[PDB]
Design a protein around this ligand. Structure first.
Ligand code: CDL
Ligand code: CDL
Ligand code: PC1
Ligand code: PC1
Ligand code: PC1
Ligand code: PC1
Ligand code: PC1
Ligand code: PC1
Ligand code: CU
Ligand code: CU
Ligand code: CU
Ligand code: MG
Lengths: 115, 246, 51, 101, 49, 105, 62, 129, 222, 77, 50, 110, 52, 131
């Protein structure tokens, strides 16, 4: 997941630096830019970052609980596929952080229903 | 750039006006409908006048409450004839009467500022510190207001917790929102998008009133402005109060 | 205050738990939905009692 | 309700998780009934309160201005009665130029 | 701790608040048929959210 | 269908179908024609009822848009086409009249 | 006939009062209203002078 | 007059006068680098306006009897293509005009084109409709 | 109903009710048992609800101020500012208490449904301002001689671009309207009509609406 | 909706103001408004019946109203 | 369904422009006329425009 | 499910957006209306009204009935053509409206 | 691009005749011909027949 | 929400019944006036012939000595407009409703709060408020 989102985050921050120090106006609406693009880029990186943070703790509990209970875990295959589909959905729910910024209702409904 | 050419032939748009099912806006003195127009350029080097700003807005600048050094009395002048026609220091009583003050209003203000009694469960109505503004946005209740939200510089958030709404004022985006308040209510608010130095102290006050009281406010504080007449009440305020009636 | 018409809507005290004001349609609907949402867990909760 | 509908119950448990919590589930059935009771009753009370509030909102929206108009008409009718009496007095004054004074 | 309190404490508190405090009404209101209703407690303080 | 009498177009019946056949799929004049169908229920088969339904269309168009007095009486053509949109009270009135015309029973 | 509704048209005053005159007037088929029901919600095109002249040069239907 | 109007009426009258007096102010600000041309004289302007009025008089019965804005716009588009070709010719010939005699020659040629070829073209078009 | 002129107003009818017996109408209305209590409640509600003005003793007259939060009324009643004189709800002293609704909509020249999917009306603002600027370029210099800016306001005629102007104002914001006004000033000074440069119709896919016989394309029906 | 309660003020200065307005209205409307200058404020009339009920009683008593009428005529004279 | 998709059906319009650390509420001139044209529910649910 | 939803978004939100990119001489308003209709009239944003008793109480339903009739009053609104009717009585109980067609105003439910 | 004579608004009999014609044309449509009720439905069906 | 998510619907609660004294008479009179279609809004009060008698003479309800009188539309200074004959005719047909309204108002005014109103405190229950 980090392999997928790191280029997007890097592009976003590089564009921010260029806008700050070169006046490239990537996010100035007066002549073409839009801050909503910056929000989209960051949150495209954003939510997958939090899903990167949270998932390994599932591994920690799924290791500790069977060890002390000296029994097999409930469904390791299903848990793996659940975390993988969560990773899949992490790339289509980045807009639930941008409900109010004025996104089109089509995109907003897509984000809400996938979230 | 280039020139305003000597002659230009311009087509009159058709069907722009459907007020009485007539598609010909223009009609010359002879009584014939005009489809074309000739525009002539007389002075080649003459500049073209800037488009005249036809937009008039009643502007209410809502800013944070400002501390008063001294409580000035109510002073009214004759007939600008700096002779004091009337001077007084009113105070609103408990029974809703603007009585004449027997105290020192500056002393009362300073005492309330320095040391006021508070409690562990004091209502927000009686304890406001980052929620006071100079002006209030008065809107009618049980009716539809379009709110075109926008920002001068950076992204802010018009956040009303009481109504449970929040509009992200984004630069460039002239974002239209529906606004319906089903109750007579005074709602406080704050900026809910990080904007910098005074992000915390960026308060909002919105008063939804029944259309009679909103109309009274409109005719006493909103319609007086946005008229572009002399500041005399006989020529402006009463003017609209007798010319535009609901 | 607008005369004796108390237009204040929040009335929230310190140590408040619920919404700031239940005077609006959106917040009334949200409060009712949250209460009845918490209503629909009994069986599940009972299950997690016996485990 | 549950595994009774299935004719290979073992498969059922297997095909769900291969884990067995049926007894806890049934104890949960009973206790859940007897614990949902009071939350539901208080929710009935809250629903009635919300309905009362909505009815009050409808009445205030529709009949508040009507009641204000009725009060305005009442005050104007009191003034009308006073004006009729005052006009009777004025007619008497016209009949008697300064006898009343 | 798990079942009995978490499913009755809020209801008992709301019932006593209505019974002993009138749901915290500001009683100086003129007409009931035109007044906003002071609701009973509807936000469970014993729940995480 | 917010201003219409039926929860869905299918409950509206044949008249509603004809309305959907009258205009293109992106036309709110379909909704105006549905309102016309509503006005024509139990009135079309009677001449006085039909005149009353046409007057109902007049009133509906006058309420929806700011209309001038007599303007709806000076419409050159009362026919409708697929790309006629309810942007004017005349268009609303024409769509409503078409809906009344397409009303059976 | 079951689904026939007025839908808010000709929603003029219906006299419930027995002594009301309009009731009897509304029973007369020749009664003419001041203005047609669809025309009540339409903006007036005539000027003030024309409207006042027409209303002064007006005769009751009876 | 001004003395017979109240304060608001005086404000409105001054507003109308000032809005009418835009061009006057712009007469003071002229650009050096612009390409000057001899403008069409007032008599030629009036003659061209009269030719346009004649065309409108010819057009009026047909378009007023037409109930389709599409047809009226089609007539307008065809006549405008013709008149725009003639207008381009006139502007080209006037911008390069060295004096008022040349400007008058160009304006008279344009007016004759309207009065001779324009009326015939418009009549044929209207006979089509 | 017995007279043939029933309902006809008698000549010289002054509508006055002086010396009229009101006992005739005793059976024409019904009053509840709590009518006195309801009357007092009505008076109290009207007094405490409508009276948003306070009688200043120094001026011996009514005054009012803009709506304020309870705190400012309570703990700063001695620091009230911007007090004005109460003029009245209506000029003639009638009632102003009416339930309101939605007024009939305005005619639309440029529909909102062109870009109704977007909550941000930037494309709609651009389109509406484009249409208005076309209209203005047609009619801008005739405004003070043939339209609303004439000196003889008795001959006032509405400027033909009023509706498109107000639609553009509604669609756009203040800053966007000012940007588009700067663009409009540049294009009006240059006298640049869009048709003077437009050549994108050649590189556009053909459509059923692009048929040469546009007028015959529409199928009108009753 | 949330309307507080406050009984009729009966403030002496406010009641004098409303009394002056009521007397002006009575004088002007008794002659069908055939006056050179109309100073009546009918809106304020309603407040006289909400803020000064005691005075209202004086105006609903025939003897009190007659005395007020005589005093006002003397003042005008 | 009650707080969205109703921009074109509104009594009137207000511009909320946020400048750094304060708000600006702009009322367009047309709103004035709209406030003059608000219908009144007079009588038994009958609507009139003056 | 996500992909079918994503395909549905791509079908009516991206490709239609790429259709019209220049001002159009002929029926520009109609073409833009089609483009916006296929995207703004999605049932997900209009279907709720058909089942409103689930969330609107009999008095709240009565109040929101006039709020919806005055909210979708504009005739020029294709999604209002897809929105379910507001001229229906509340299923459980209706207090204000007796007949759904006996009004005193065409655009008001009372 | 001349115009034609616009006929008077149809009477109830003409409305009933056109309603019957629309009913018959609707009934003629097969179940496997999936064309929604639209103004362009007949044109699209003819286009589909030619394409087939 | 869902099919049965609130688990209860308070159908027992009725619409707030109006107990105003002369509300029905006021509504009938206002309906009659709207039928009359009088541009003067002051006719909504049954006491208008005594409150604004100028409507029957010349319509001059206010003094414009200092405030300018600048009519622009027909919908301007409607109160400054005398009742035209036609209007008067359609205001004559409402005289019965107006008289009933005024009689109801007079009877309500004549009511007094005596000391025999023992249930004055507990009148909210009487005025159908305990829903
Ligand atoms: C008047 C009459 C009034 C009454 C009418 C009805 C009559 C009822 C009859 C009795 C009945 O139905 O008994 C059922 C009763 C229960 O048996 P069961 O099917 O094993 O019980 C279901 C359990 O859930 C056991 O299944 P389980 O727990 O192993 O697995 C199910 C569970 C698996 O659970 C899990 O995997 C995890 C559980 C937690 C998940 C939580 C997720 C969300 C929250 C996260 C936090 O599924 C789920 O979790 C799915 C989602 C949640 C559903 C929870 C409830 C279970 C539904 C199935 O049957 C028996 O006791 C068997 C005996 C025979 C019964 C029938 C004959 C009765 C007597 C007849 C003679 C009478 C003579 C005198 C008269
Ligand atoms: C002797 C036995 C007689 C049995 C008769 C049959 C049962 C009739 C029940 C009717 C209930 C009903 O329809 O209510 C609708 C009624 C709806 O009223 P509404 O429509 O709002 O109108 C208000 C009325 O006009 C005015 O409202 P109100 O002020 O008149 O409210 C009185 C009403 C208030 O209603 C209740 O109290 C309902 C019952 C509450 C739960 C009862 C215990 C359940 C325990 C389950 C396990 C929990 C763990 O009380 C009753 O109806 C109870 C009558 C019988 C009392 C004695 C029962 C003894 C055996 C209990 C088993 O519900 C309420 O008013 C709810 C109020 C209570 C909320 C919850 C309070 C706490 C509940 C749990 C108590 C503690 C249990 C656990 C102990 C340990 C805790 C740590
Ligand atoms: C017809 C519908 C039949 C199924 C209803 C839901 C069954 C279910 O899972 O209930 C348990 C869950 C949890 O309920 P519970 O098991 O906590 O029980 C609550 C207490 N009693 C026994 C009184 C119901 O039910 C719900 O979540 C109900 C949601 C609202 C109803 C609509 C459901 C739509 C989907 C079906
Ligand atoms: C939710 C259940 C969906 C179906 C699951 C399934 O496989 O069911 C098969 C079973 C039937 O098959 P079965 O009970 O023989 O189990 C399958 C056994 N094997 C795989 C070994 C062949 O369906 C049911 O038991 C019906 C579901 C419950 C219906 C309750 C109705 C109440 C009224
Ligand atoms: C989920 C995890 C929760 C973890 C903590 C749970 C317990 C919290 C502390 C108790 C709080 C009680 C309380 O006041 O609740 C408020 C509620 C409500 O009280 P209230 O009316 O004060 O509520 C608040 C009121 N307002 C909101 C207006 C301020 O109290 C109760 O419901 C009282 C019930 C009785 C509590 C006392 C104990 C009962 C007996 C228990 C026996 C257990 C087994 C003993 C075996 C002995 C063998 C020898
Ligand atoms: C193995 C089983 C299948 C698993 C899933 C595999 C993928 C299957 C295909 C999924 C496609 C999802 C597309 C969503 C959007 C479709 C277009 C749409 O919204 O149409 C609405 C419109 C509604 O009309 P409208 O109101 O939008 O009108 C404008 C459009 N016209 C005028 C052209 C109709 O309906 C249609 O277009 C009808 C056809 C829809 C279905 C298309 C084919 C689906 C084939 C599925 C095969 C499965 C095996
Ligand atoms: C499940 C796993 C999902 C993995 C991928 C998740 C990210 C998907 C891509 C997100 C960015 C993106 O493409 O945005 C749409 C971008 C946004 O670009 P845009 O900003 O120019 O969009 C124009 C405006 N709208 C959204 C209205 C169209 O659109 C495209 O790239 C359009 C491509 C052509 C049309 C579709 C062809 C297929
Ligand atoms: C196990 C999954 C658990 C989580 C998910 C729970 C729900 C599972 C079932 C979901 C079924 C629907 C999935 C897609 C939803 C989004 C698309 C949609 O609304 O389609 C309707 C839309 C309808 O069009 P529309 O509603 O978008 O707008 C067109 C205009 N009107 C409103 C006039 C119709 O598209 C279709 O109907 C075509 C669908 C084609 C594919 C069908 C499925 C093939 C497999
Ligand atoms: Cu996220
Ligand atoms: Cu900020
Ligand atoms: Cu901020
Ligand atoms: Mg934010």
């Amino acid at each position: 997941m980090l392999a997928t989102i790191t280029p997007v985050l890097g592009a976003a921050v590089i564009m921010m630096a260029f806008d700050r120090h070169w006046q490239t106006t990537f996010f100035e609406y007066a002549y073409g830019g839009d801050p909503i693009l910056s929000q989209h880029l960051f949150w495209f990186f954003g939510h997958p970052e939090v899903y990167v943070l949270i998932i390994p703790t599932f591994g920690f509990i799924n290791m500790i609980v069977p060890h002390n209970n000296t029994r097999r875990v409930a469904s390791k295959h299903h848990m793996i596929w659940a975390i993988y589909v969560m990773a899949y959905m992490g790339y289509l729910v980045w807009g639930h952080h941008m409900y109010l910024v004025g996104l089109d209702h089509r995109s907003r409904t897509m984000y809400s229903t996938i979230t | 750039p280039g020139e305003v050419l000597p002659l230009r032939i311009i087509k009159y748009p058709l069907g722009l006006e459907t007020i009485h099912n007539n598609i010909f806006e223009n009609t010359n003195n002879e009584g014939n409908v005009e489809l074309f127009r000739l525009r002539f350029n007389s002075n080649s080097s003459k500049m073209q006048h800037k488009l005249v700003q036809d937009t008039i807005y009643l502007t209410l600048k809502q800013k944070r409450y400002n501390r008063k050094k001294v409580v000035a009395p109510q002073i009214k002048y004759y007939k600008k004839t700096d002779l004091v026609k009337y001077t007084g220091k009113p105070y609103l009583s408990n029974d809703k009467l603007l009585k004449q003050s027997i105290y020192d209003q500056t002393t009362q203000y300073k005492l309330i500022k320095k040391n006021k009694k508070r409690g562990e469960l004091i209502p927000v109505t009686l304890a406001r510190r980052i929620l006071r503004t100079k002006k209030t946005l008065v809107l009618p209740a049980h009716v539809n207001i379009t709110l075109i939200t926008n920002s001068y510089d950076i992204v802010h958030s018009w956040f009303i917790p009481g109504l449970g709404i929040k509009l992200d004022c984004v630069p460039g985006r002239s974002t239209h929102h529906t606004f319906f308040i089903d109750n007579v209510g005074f709602y406080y608010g704050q900026c809910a998008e990080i904007c910098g130095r005074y992000h915390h102290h960026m308060p909002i006050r919105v008063c939804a009133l029944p259309f009679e009281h909103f109309l009274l406010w409109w005719n006493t504080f909103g319609l007086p402005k946005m008229l572009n007449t002399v500041s005399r009440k006989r020529f402006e305020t009463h003017y609209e109060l007798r010319k535009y009636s609901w | 205050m607008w005369g004796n018409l108390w237009t204040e809507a929040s009335y929230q005290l310190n140590f408040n738990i619920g919404f700031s004001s239940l005077r609006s349609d959106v917040l009334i609907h949200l409060a009712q939905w949250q209460y009845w949402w918490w209503f629909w867990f009994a069986l599940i909760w009972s299950f997690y009692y016996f485990i | 309700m549950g595994s009774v509908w299935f004719r290979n119950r073992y498969w059922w448990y297997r095909s769900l998780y291969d884990d067995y919590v049926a007894r806890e589930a049934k104890l949960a059935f009973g206790i859940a009934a007897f614990i949902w009771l009071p939350h539901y009753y208080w929710g009935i009370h809250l629903n009635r309160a919300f309905e009362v509030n909505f009815s009050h909102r409808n009445y205030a929206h529709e009949w508040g201005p009507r009641r204000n108009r009725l009060a305005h008409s009442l005050e104007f009718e009191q003034f009308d009665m006073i004006l009729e009496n005052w006009q009777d007095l004025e007619d008497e004054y016209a009949q008697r130029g300064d006898g009343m004074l | 701790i798990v079942l009995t309190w978490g499913w009755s404490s809020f209801q008992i508190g709301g019932y006593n608040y209505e019974r002993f405090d009138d749901n915290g009404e500001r009683r100086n209101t003129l007409y009931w048929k035109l007044s906003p209703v002071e609701f009973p407690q509807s936000k469970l303080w014993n729940r995480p959210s | 269908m917010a201003q219409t009498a039926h929860q869905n177009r299918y409950q509206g019946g044949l008249c509603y179908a004809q309305c959907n056949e009258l205009f293109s799929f992106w036309n709110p004049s379909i909704q105006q024609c549905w309102k016309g169908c509503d006005f024509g229920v139990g009135r079309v088969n009677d001449p006085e009822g039909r005149i009353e339904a046409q007057q109902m269309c007049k009133r509906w168009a006058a309420e929806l848009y700011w209309t001038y007095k007599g303007e709806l009486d000076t419409i050159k053509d009362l026919r409708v086409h697929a790309d006629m949109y309810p942007t004017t009270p005349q268009n609303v009135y024409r769509a409503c009249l078409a809906g009344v015309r397409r009303q059976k029973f | 006939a079951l689904n026939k509704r007025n839908w808010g048209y000709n929603a003029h005053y219906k006299p419930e009062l027995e002594r009301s005159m309009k009731k009897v007037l509304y029973a007369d088929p020749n009664y003419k209203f001041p203005i047609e029901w669809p025309e009540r919600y339409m903006a007036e095109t005539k000027t003030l002078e024309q409207v006042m002249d027409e209303e002064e040069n007006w005769e009751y239907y009876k | 007059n001004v003395e017979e109007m109240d304060t608001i009426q005086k404000m409105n009258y001054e507003a109308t006068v000032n809005m009418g007096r835009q061009d006057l102010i712009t007469r003071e600000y002229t650009f050096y680098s612009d390409y000057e041309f001899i403008p069409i004289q007032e008599d030629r302007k009036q003659q061209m306006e009269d030719a346009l009025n004649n065309l409108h008089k010819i057009i009026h019965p047909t378009v007023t009897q037409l109930k389709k804005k599409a047809n009226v716009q089609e007539i307008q588009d065809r006549v405008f293509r013709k008149l725009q070709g003639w207008e381009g010719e006139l502007n080209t010939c006037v911008f390069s005009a060295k004096n008022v005699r040349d400007s008058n020659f160009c304006a008279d040629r344009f007016t004759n084109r309207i009065n001779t070829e324009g009326v015939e073209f418009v009549k044929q078009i209207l006979r089509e409709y | 109903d017995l007279p043939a002129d029933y309902g006809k107003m008698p000549a010289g009818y002054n509508f006055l009710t002086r010396g009229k017996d009101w006992r005739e109408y005793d059976k024409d209305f019904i009053l509840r048992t709590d009518a006195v209590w309801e009357k007092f409640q009505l008076e109290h509600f009207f007094r405490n609800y409508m009276k948003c003005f306070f009688f200043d003793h120094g001026l011996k007259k009514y005054q009012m101020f803009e709506p304020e939060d309870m705190y400012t009324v309570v703990f700063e009643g001695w620091a009230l500012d911007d007090l004005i004189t109460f003029p009245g709800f209506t000029p003639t002293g009638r009632t102003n208490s009416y339930q309101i609704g939605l007024s009939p909509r305005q005619r639309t020249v440029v529909p909102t449904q062109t870009f109704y999917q977007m909550q941000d009306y930037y494309m709609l603002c651009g389109l509406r301002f484009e249409r208005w600027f076309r209209c203005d370029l047609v009619y801008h210099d005739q405004r003070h001689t043939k339209f609303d800016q004439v000196k003889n306001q008795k001959n006032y005629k509405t400027y033909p671009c009023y509706r498109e102007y107000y639609e553009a104002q509604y669609a756009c914001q203040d800053d966007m309207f000012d940007f588009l006004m700067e663009l409009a000033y540049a294009r009006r000074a240059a006298d640049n009509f869009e048709s003077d440069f437009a050549s994108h119709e050649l590189t556009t896919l053909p459509t059923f609406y692009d048929t040469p016989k546009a007028a015959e394309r529409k199928t009108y029906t009753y | 909706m949330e309307v507080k309660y406050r009984g009729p003020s009966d403030d002496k200065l406010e009641c004098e103001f409303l009394e002056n307005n009521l007397l002006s209205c009575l004088r002007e409307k008794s002659v069908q408004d055939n006056v050179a200058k109309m100073t009546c404020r009918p809106e304020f009339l309603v407040w006289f019946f909400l803020e000064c009920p005691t005075k209202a009683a004086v105006y609903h008593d025939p003897k009190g109203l007659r005395n007020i009428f005589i005093q006002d005529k003397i003042k005008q004279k | 369904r009650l707080i969205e998709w109703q921009n074109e059906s509104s009594l009137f319009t207000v511009r909320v422009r946020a400048r750094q650390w304060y708000w600006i509420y702009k009322f367009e001139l047309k709103n004035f006329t709209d406030i003059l044209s608000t219908p009144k529910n007079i009588g038994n649910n009958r609507w009139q425009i003056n | 499910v996500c992909g079918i939803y994503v395909i549905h978004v791509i079908y009516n939100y991206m490709i239609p957006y790429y259709w019209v990119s220049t001002p159009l001489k002929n029926d520009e308003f109609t073409r833009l209306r089609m483009k916006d209709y296929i995207a703004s009239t999605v049932l997900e944003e209009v279907y709720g009204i058909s089942y409103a008793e689930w969330g609107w109480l009999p008095h709240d339903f009565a109040y929101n009935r006039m709020r919806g009739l005055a909210g979708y009053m504009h005739p020029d609104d294709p999604r209002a053509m897809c929105t379910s009717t507001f001229h229906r009585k509340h299923k459980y109980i209706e207090h204000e409206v007796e007949k759904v067609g006996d009004y005193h105003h065409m655009t008001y439910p009372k | 691009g001349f115009e034609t004579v616009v006929p008077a608004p149809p009477t109830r009999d003409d409305e009933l005749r056109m309603i019957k014609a629309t009913e018959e044309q609707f009934l003629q449509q097969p179940r496997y011909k999936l064309y929604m009720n639209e103004a362009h439905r007949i044109a699209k069906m003819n286009h589909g027949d030619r394409h087939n | 929400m869902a099919l049965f998510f609130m688990a209860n619907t308070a159908i027992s609660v009725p619409s707030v019944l109006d107990t105003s004294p002369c509300m029905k008479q006021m509504l009938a009179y206002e309906d009659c006036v709207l039928d009359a279609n009088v541009p003067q809004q002051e006719v909504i009060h049954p006491q208008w012939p005594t409150i604004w008698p100028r409507l029957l003479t010349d319509g001059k309800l206010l003094e414009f000595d200092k405030v300018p009188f600048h009519p622009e539309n027909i919908y301007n200074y409607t109160y400054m407009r005398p009742l035209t004959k036609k209007n008067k005719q359609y205001l004559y047909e409402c005289e019965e409703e107006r008289f009933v309204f005024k009689a109801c108002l007079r009877k309500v005014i004549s009511l007094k709060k005596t000391d025999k109103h023992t249930s004055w405190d507990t009148a909210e229950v009487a005025n159908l408020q305990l829903t």
